[PDB]
Amino acid sequence: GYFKIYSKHTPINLVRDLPQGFSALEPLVDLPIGINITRFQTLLALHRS
């Protein structure tokens, strides 16, 4: 019933390709929800201007 989220923000010196290296992720959040999960999605900001 806890939804844990770890995260890390590293700066690449590329724009959009997966690099190589080691970087450990530090815990961010903890939510005592109870929710069941089986699926997920993503959200994007369109092109309009």
Partner: protein, 49 residues
């Protein structure tokens, strides 16, 4: 109820609050309080952190 201020007890309005504690099957939730004591450094004294 036509409540009037000159009503004998037992006809005057009473406000009621019913607290109902329930325990579904989650991981946890609210709970009692927990006071905090002091800290005596340097002395084999029992402790709880």
């Amino acid at each position: 109820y036509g409540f009037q201020p000159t009503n004998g007890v037992g006809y005057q309005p009473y406000r009621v609050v019913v607290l109902s504690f329930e325990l579904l099957h989650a991981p946890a939730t609210v709970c009692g309080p927990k006071k905090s004591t002091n800290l005596v450094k340097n002395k084999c004294v029992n402790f709880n952190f």
